Amino acid sequence: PKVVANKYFTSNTAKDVWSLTNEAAAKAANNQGRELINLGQGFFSYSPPQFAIKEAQKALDIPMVNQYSPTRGRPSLINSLIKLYSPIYNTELKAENVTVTTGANEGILSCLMGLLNAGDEVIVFEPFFDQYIPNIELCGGKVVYVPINPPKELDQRNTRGEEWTIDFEQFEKAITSKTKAVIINTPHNPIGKVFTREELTTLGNICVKHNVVIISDEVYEHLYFTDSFTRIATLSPEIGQLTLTVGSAGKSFAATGWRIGWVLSLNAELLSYAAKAHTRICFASPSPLQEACANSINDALKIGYFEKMRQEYINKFKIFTSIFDELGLPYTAPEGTYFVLVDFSKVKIPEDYPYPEEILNKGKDFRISHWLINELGVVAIPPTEFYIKEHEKAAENLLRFAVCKDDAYLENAVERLKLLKDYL
Amino acid sequence: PKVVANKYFTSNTAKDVWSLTNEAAAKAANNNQGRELINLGQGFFSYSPPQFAIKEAQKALDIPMVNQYSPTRGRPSLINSLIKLYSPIYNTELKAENVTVTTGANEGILSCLMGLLNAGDEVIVFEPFFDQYIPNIELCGGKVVYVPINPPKELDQRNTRGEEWTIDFEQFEKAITSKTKAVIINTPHNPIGKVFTREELTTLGNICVKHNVVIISDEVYEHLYFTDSFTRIATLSPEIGQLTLTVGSAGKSFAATGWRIGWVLSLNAELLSYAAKAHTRICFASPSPLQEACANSINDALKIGYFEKMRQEYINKFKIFTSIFDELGLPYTAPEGTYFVLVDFSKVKIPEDYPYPEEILNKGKDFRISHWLINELGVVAIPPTEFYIKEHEKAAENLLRFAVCKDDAYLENAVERLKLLKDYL
């Protein structure tokens, strides 16, 4: 039959970067004698820590833990979060300041749905997280894009996080009477940038001045390599009253398939809206995993797991970034996350290399990623997918690498990438 | 500060049935002083899922990658078990493209609606409706259109059958416009317990193919039926199947409501793809360990007759429970499926001046009957008028919904307490 479906889906038919990257990989395994090395997957290749696994198996042995949890979450998990974040915020947080969602992505969607009215505007920073766009638009929202500008020096030397910056003048100028909120991602995916207390302080105050809700995506909150990680909500009472901070159990415990997340806010009424939306979207989040997470947070604090994970990742990047320092390719040292942006502009690719008709329209990186897969057998992600075409040139030379793999895998990627010397 | 939230939530402020019932049970626990309350208002199991499912779940957690994101449409393993389970039921060798895993049936129904709806579209629901249907439809820009499932005229004279509750199909078809995108059919029905027949579903389906209206069949209770057969509308005719999206629920099938794993199937691959795309944008991927647990639990269930075992177990639960209404002379609609039962309380002599909170004076009568029952007997039941639009409400104003998804002992204890109704004749 000829059913008319939602126009939002029928009018957006283009393959996305995963779909296109998977096809290229699919075919490049032709590289025979070689196994493709995938650094394009933004999720861990290994298992969650054993203590996490054990808590989940125990939880399943508790009859009612297998049934619907209260809509805002299991008290046990809301309590482990109260315990964990109360010291961080300097408040004796209560249940009203916490709400559990089915992962950070649906937690963000719950924030957007509880706050948006047809026509409303939401600002996002480029390179943005792919899910942000449909979440906002599916809630009747209009997306506004202000870039996280690269360093002019981006492709001559290795850059830092604080070198990618937002034009807070340009940002305060995108705010209108239709602006309901702004999504801020720190540590940033894919820049790895950890927004500073002042970069964040300015934003915070701008928004309280313009009464704009701050939806803060802090899923990589535990994965930072700077002396400190600043939470914009803990900056100044007024900012905190306008901030909804999202976290992820999956990214925290290397269990992306668990689908447990949470949203915290000092402004309980603001939060009630995300909570009510969550109730109407998912109703309740996975029960056995909520209990596992409640106990894992405690197991984690007791054994210094987060610090240990941060060191493991400092190591992983030491292993990985080394070949780029050797090859001469600049990159922005990650301040957090397990993502790294490498400039491939200096790589000499045949000006007549054969690319699919599907990517000639795309920015440069889509072709670089394609070549790299067919020629070196290494999968990397082109970041211009997280841009609006007109703001996209500032990164058409970059590639995103995800190092959430075990050390050995990373070292073998470094060896394969030595072939990048056959192209200066 | 002063932030304008979504008006949808700021406009719908009234307390729902759950809040009211819970409150009433609170102030009533005092009085009931030495009497524990009997809660038959909870629509979810009070016990653990079968030990075989529990074990599949703990085992699944030991496979590393099973703890990371699963493919957006579902883990192949679960899709395979679903293809294996339904291919014989349908009459096709179903493929991955006819199956899609969602985070429970509720969010799968939402995914279906979000993939098909455009601003202004209309979706028809049948009263009494499942609660989540309304916001799911409206949050996606839909306008809900209500058509009641009419109760038998003998409803409060004698026990009735699910088959006696009927949709007025001329009224239904007459409610279809060019704006009508889909209709939601829930069978076995929550809460009548009605198992729509092959004939009821044939006529419903033929009407839908005639007006090109998508059928969203909520069949989470597909395994919990007491009739000879359970008709799946999508298997009635190729034309009906092409307009149908059928929903299932791992939590309702395996007594595991906290797992949040469901699925949507359709012979129309393109129709299904829209539900899948929506799911991808709503939750991205469903819980991985539990999908794997479900993949295997489905295989275990077929090799041990688990679904048949649970049907018998529920036939017994109702036999235990309904027997008191037979002895008391209170008519009910014998359930044809589900673990819900609608019982008529119109005969109960509740004092005409009995006090009720201002909050429920405007509510259908059943809300007050529920209030009274909690206070005077310490038994919790839900007023089904919550699942009606006010203008169609009357037809169920004398009913109370009970849910027997409790263990036999608890049910037998409920029966003993309910004998007290004898004093109110």
Curated annotation (Swiss-Prot), chain B:
Q: Which cofactors go with this protein?
A: pyridoxal 5'-phosphate
Gene3D superfamilies named in the record: Aspartate Aminotransferase, domain 1, Type I PLP-dependent aspartate aminotransferase-like (Major domain)
Keyword list (alphabetical) reads: Aminotransferase, Cytoplasm, Mitochondrion, Pyridoxal phosphate, Transferase
Entry-linked CDD domains? AAT_like
Pathway where this protein functions: Amino-acid degradation; L-kynurenine degradation; kynurenate from L-kynurenine: step 1/2
**What InterPro entries does the database record attribute to this sequence?**
Aminotransferase_I/II_large, Kynurenine-oxoglutarate_AT, NHTrfase_class1_PyrdxlP-BS, PyrdxlP-dep_Trfase, PyrdxlP-dep_Trfase_major, PyrdxlP-dep_Trfase_small
Q: Give me the Gene Ontology terms describing cellular component.
A: cytoplasm; mitochondrion
Entries under Pfam families matching the protein: Aminotran_1_2 (PF00155)
Q: Where in the cell is it found?
A: Cytoplasm; Mitochondrion
Q: Which residues carry this modification: N6-(pyridoxal phosphate)lysine?
A: K252
Something else the entry says is: Present with 1600 molecules/cell in log phase SD medium.
Which proteins does it associate with, and in what oligomeric form? Homodimer.
The Swiss-Prot or TrEMBL record describes its family as follows: Belongs to the class-I pyridoxal-phosphate-dependent aminotransferase family.
Function summary: Catalyzes the irreversible transamination of the L-tryptophan metabolite L-kynurenine to form kynurenic acid (KA).
Task: Please report the name of this protein according to its UniProt entry.
Answer: Probable kynurenine--oxoglutarate transaminase BNA3
Q: Species name for this entry?
A: Saccharomyces cerevisiae (strain ATCC 204508 / S288c)
